[PDB]
Amino acid sequence: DWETSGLVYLDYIRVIEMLRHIQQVDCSGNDLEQLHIKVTSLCSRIEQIQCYSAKDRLAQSDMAKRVANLSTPDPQRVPLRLLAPHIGRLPMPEDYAMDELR
């Protein structure tokens, strides 16, 4: 039943290996959408059950961003300016391209 975190962790390494080996492919990998959905559901713990995870959230963000340089990955970002301009000018970078470009 509950088998999403391990599947996402296994798909992240395979996606990273495929991106490091093949740099011209840019199609859907069937299970890529499911892995992205699982990573998003695991990272949205603070919105689902209000979890204050740090190392797990960082690992999930790293696994979601390591495969974004080959496929598409439309989501996977941060959380607006509600935590960046009210905590210490530091709230996990994400869409630096969209922030510094148009």
Partner 1 sequence: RLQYYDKVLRLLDVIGLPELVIQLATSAITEAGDDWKSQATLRTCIFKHHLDLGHNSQAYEALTQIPDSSRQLDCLRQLVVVLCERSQLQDLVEFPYVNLHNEVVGIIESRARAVDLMT
The residues that touch partner 1, with contacts defined as CB under 8 A, are: 19, 23-27, 69-72
Between 24 and 50, name the residue whose CB sits nearer to partner 1. 24
Between 61 and 71, name the residue whose CB sits nearer to partner 1. 71
Between 36 and 42, name the residue whose CB sits nearer to partner 1. 36
44 close to 77: Cβ distance less than 8 angstroms: no
Q: How far is Cα 33 from Cα 99, in angstroms, rounded to an integer?
A: 25
The single residue listed with the structure tokens 């039943």 is 1
Minimum gap (Å) between residue 100 Cβ and partner 1: 13
Minimum gap (Å) between residue 97 Cβ and partner 1: 10
DSSP code per residue over 50-101: ----SHHHHHHHHHHHTTTTTS--------TTSSSTTTTS-S----HHHHH-
Minimum gap (Å) between residue 34 Cβ and partner 1: 20
